[PDB]
């Protein structure tokens, strides 16, 4: 059992966190979650959960990793081991997350190999996959609305090849399956420690995606009709806030895009030095993450407003109200750039870079927690080459279910339920509750002061005590007292077995906490008042 390594430099933490949760949850998912919830109304619970629960739980898992130099699961051995099932819940969340996140990267890669033509296949619709109800978007205001855009038909009929529902999975798309396998080879050969441990990361991870996001923002803001998209993006419809879809979507988009019910930020904090001020670095990285989401949302919603101006249809109905929105709006914007082939290549390499670095961080966090769970069973040698390949192989094979002919329906089920549903509220509420009330805000603030150097302020104290538990419990209860079923793109109603499977994914994430509580109360000898007292005592 070798001693646990640290980062060996201060900037290795920041690059592994900037590459950690600045990814597709900012540039791909905050877009359609904002779009699906009316745009303006999404930002109010977004910033409420950001400034009451996002940066709080972000600093919370980072400093839990820094305090207890352990990743994900075994970090709770000194943070009330009775709730050690928060770590197992986090690993279930991050496993299902790795599956569907890498499916997004497979779609981006399929677009990338379809970007090298002189004419982009979504730029026009005289192809084999296009319905006869299509023409160019520039011609949609001159013909007499049951007419469909070339980018939308490309997305649903050559990339997705979208089927009638989750009841009809269709055939496995061999193109997308090979794309998914190539991206998993890229991931496996980067968790193989040969790549990403270089000095050229900073000019290829923190430099080029933000430059490409700046170029996309410049292109989207100068489009005609971008002001209507910005008004859709910013101006809140208050009546939507009385519905729990917007609160759940915004709160779990905070908890998703901060990667913060996953054990991965706990894992990244576990390589921090003890006496190392993680707090200011966490604030800078959280500002980077939320600013990336906000700026890329400005970009993509300006593009959506341009599309609504050009096609003559309303903003909320111009593209997909579901997981494909970054694959309609951003390719459509790229077709409006000079030399759109080169910008298609750069944009899908940008998505690949963001999503790949994020995937390396979450996959490495899952692996870090699972080798902290079993040291000397998974050493730094040959067993962490076979376990790595096994984790990648089952995540790829279970990702084949979501990349078939009807794989968007399974993907939207995974996205809404498996790693960003009430499971994120569950794990975040229980993290804040265990800290604040079984471990103590005062005792944990003393722990923080021993290494950070100062007392965390009343914001962190009252967020871990009151604000994050109240927000998570309120959205959890309010999503059930006013329950609406998951729908894909406002028109597909899911069958009850599919909603049950999504709830099963959520509960497989959720129920790791009470089942570990039951197992630990059953494996410890004594009465209940002695068992609970022993299992809440840190080790």
């Amino acid at each position, epitope marked *: 059992p070798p001693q646990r390594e640290k980062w060996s430099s201060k900037i290795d933490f920041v690059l592994s966190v900037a590459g950690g949760f600045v990814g597709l949850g900012n540039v791909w998912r905050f877009p359609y979650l904002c779009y699906k919830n009316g745009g303006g109304a999404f930002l109010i619970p977004y910033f409420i959960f950001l400034f009451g629960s996002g940066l709080p739980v972000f600093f919370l898992e980072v400093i839990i990793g820094q305090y207890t130099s352990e990743g994900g699961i075994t970090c709770w051995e000194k943070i009330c081991p009775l709730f050690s099932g928060i770590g197992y819940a986090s690993i279930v969340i991050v496993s299902l997350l790795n599956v569907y996140y890498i499916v997004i990267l497979a779609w981006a890669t399929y677009y990338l190999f379809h970007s090298f033509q002189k004419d982009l296949p979504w730029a026009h619709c005289n192809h084999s996959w296009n319905t006869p109800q299509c023409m160019e978007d520039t011609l949609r205001r001159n013909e007499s609305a049951n007419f469909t855009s070339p980018v939308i038909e490309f997305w649903e009929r050559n990339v997705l090849s979208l089927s009638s529902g989750i009841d009809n999975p269709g055939s496995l798309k061999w193109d997308l399956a090979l794309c998914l396998l190539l991206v998993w080879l890229v991931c496996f050969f980067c968790i193989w420690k040969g790549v990403r441990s270089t000095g050229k990361v900073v000019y290829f991870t923190a430099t080029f995606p933000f430059a490409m996001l700046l170029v996309l923002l410049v292109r989207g803001l100068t489009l005609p009709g971008a002001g209507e998209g910005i008004k859709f993006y910013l101006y809140p419809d208050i009546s939507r806030l009385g519905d729990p879809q917007v609160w759940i979507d915004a709160g779990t988009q905070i908890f998703f895009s901060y990667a913060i019910c996953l054990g991965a930020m706990t894992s990244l904090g576990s390589y921090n030095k003890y*006496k190392y001020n993680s707090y200011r670095d966490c604030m800078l990285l959280g500002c980077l993450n939320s600013g990336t989401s906000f700026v890329s949302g400005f970009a993509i919603f300006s593009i959506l407003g341009f599309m609504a101006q050009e096609q003559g249809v309303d903003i909320a109905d111009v593209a997909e109200s579901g997981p494909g929105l970054a694959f309609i709006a951003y390719p459509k914007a790229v077709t409006m750039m000079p030399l759109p082939t080169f910008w298609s290549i750069l944009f899908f390499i940008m998505l690949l870079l963001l999503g790949l670095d994020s995937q390396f961080v979450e996959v490495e966090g899952q692996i870090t927690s699972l080798v902290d769970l079993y040291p000397s069973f998974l050493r730094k040698g040959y067993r962490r080459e076979i376990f790595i390949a096994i984790l990648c192989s089952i995540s790829y094979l279970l990702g084949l279910t979501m990349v078939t002919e009807g794989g968007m329906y399974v993907f939207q089920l995974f996205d809404y339920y498996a790693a960003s549903g009430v499971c994120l509220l569950w794990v975040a509420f229980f993290e804040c509750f265990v800290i604040a009330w079984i471990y103590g805000v*005062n005792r944990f*603030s*003393e722990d923080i*002061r*021993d290494m950070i*150097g*100062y*007392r965390p302020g009343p914001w962190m104290k009252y967020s871990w005590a009151v604000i994050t538990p109240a927000l998570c419990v309120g959205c959890f209860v309010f999503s059930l007292v006013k329950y609406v079923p998951l729908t894909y793109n406002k028109v597909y109603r899911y069958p009850d077995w599919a909603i049950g499977l999504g709830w099963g994914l959520a509960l497989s994430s959720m129920l790791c906490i009470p089942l570990v509580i039951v197992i630990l109360l059953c494996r410890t000898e004594g009465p209940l008042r002695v068992r609970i007292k022993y299992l809440i005592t840190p080790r």
Partner: antibody
Amino acid sequence: EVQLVESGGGLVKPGGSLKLSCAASGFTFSSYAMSWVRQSPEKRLEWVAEISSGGRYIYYSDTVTGRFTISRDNARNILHLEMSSLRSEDTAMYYCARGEVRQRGFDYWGQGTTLTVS
Amino acid sequence: ENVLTQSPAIMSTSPGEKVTMTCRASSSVGSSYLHWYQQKSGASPKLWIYSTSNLASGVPARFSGSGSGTSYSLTISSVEAEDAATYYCQQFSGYPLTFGSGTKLEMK
């Protein structure tokens, strides 16, 4: 008004024992780490012992790392420093210092207890 | 220990003249962790400059601090008659906390 009043300093024999009592007032004593800093008659400030807010993290200098014990009484708001095996080079001017934020230092000091060893 | 070798204790300057005093540390202090304390004649020390630049409450703006890593400085723009005191630098990062030597400012 943050007030730190120390007491219990006097003349002790070499190898003896003494207990100081920094009585804290005007602030929530359980929320700040407190230190004992001693000043030699040559006026060279030396940090002795730091205790955290709850007493879980306790630090000592190398000169007193095995014979000094710092403790708090958070209910009545008194900081303590119990000494043993008081050697000749412990004659000093003992201050309790409210050092909790490490990027701010000992922002409030107390008065002094003249510990003399002879 | 992190020994802070500070400027020699006996320095004597006329009032109203800009003075400076240095504080060299054996190890590398993170420059948000070395603080300056002013102790008068027969009084307790009090915090003067913290995180080597910020001025504590009741410290005049004519005091200033500078430096990082190893060399740290206390600077007075114009010494008034109330500056006759001893100034101690003190890293407050490494858990064996150490003060500097004395630097006594005296008049003419």
